[PDB]
């Protein structure tokens, strides 16, 4: 997160870290046993870390739970990043206290201008990862804006969230993390051209298109 | 292999994206090993 602020400790209880030796992606806890992330964050072995604030210091609050299964969207295109969504089943459920909670799926897609919270442990510039969870308030942008910034590359499954002036954006290491608007998961950190560049807002998987796929996939697993 | 890697424009927001190949010889048929939006993979060459 470039241009954001350090979150209050544990104020984003649905935010997870995906770890396979170190943090590499974010994720969103949507029920006690299921995390939603980006398909491009796929690894054959993942440990999910819940309750985190300082990813580099055990603060007591953490749950460390391995992934038992990992299901990428069947139509994921690794070359265009269309359908950039995956689900992770925890090998045992997380305990839901005040420091680990679920986030709701959307009831519908967010209107342009809806104000959202984006979070993660990605770079805050060069690099590198901050220790403490970062936070950034940002609005959904019109499809029109999104496609002027990235002509030909925005599918029906992508939304742009942020500022066209730049300065404020998700960055490398925020991949797979949440965009939450009026208490609903609306975006998954996916891609962009650099970070915080002018007319290059972040591109996000449009989670509202996947509500049924999420429920169906969970139902079958 | 003959041809160029395609021009790309975004990058996935992962620091160390996955590489599914290191050289063209690891790619079937006329496919090249190219950095894309998210790491290296076998893709069709351009002109
Ligand atoms: Ca910690």
Author numbering:
A (entry chain A): 16 to 34, 37 to 67, 69 to 125, 127 to 130, 132 to 145, 148 to 183, 184A, 184 to 187, ...
B (entry chain B): 60 to 106
What text appears in the publication on this structure?
1/2SLPI (recombinant C-terminal domain of SLPI Arg58–Ala107) has a potent inhibitory activity against multiple serine proteases such as trypsin, chymotrypsin, elastase, chymase and cathepsin G as that of intact SLPI. Generally, a main part of the affinity and inhibitory activity of the biological inhibitors depends on the P1 residue which penetrates deeply into the S1 pocket of the proteases.
Two complexes (one with chains A and B, the other with chains C and D) appear to interact with the reversible inhibition mechanism. Additionally, one uncomplexed PPT molecule (chain E) exists per asymmetric unit. The primary binding region appears to range from P3 Gln70i to P2′ Leu74i by intermolecular hydrogen bonds.
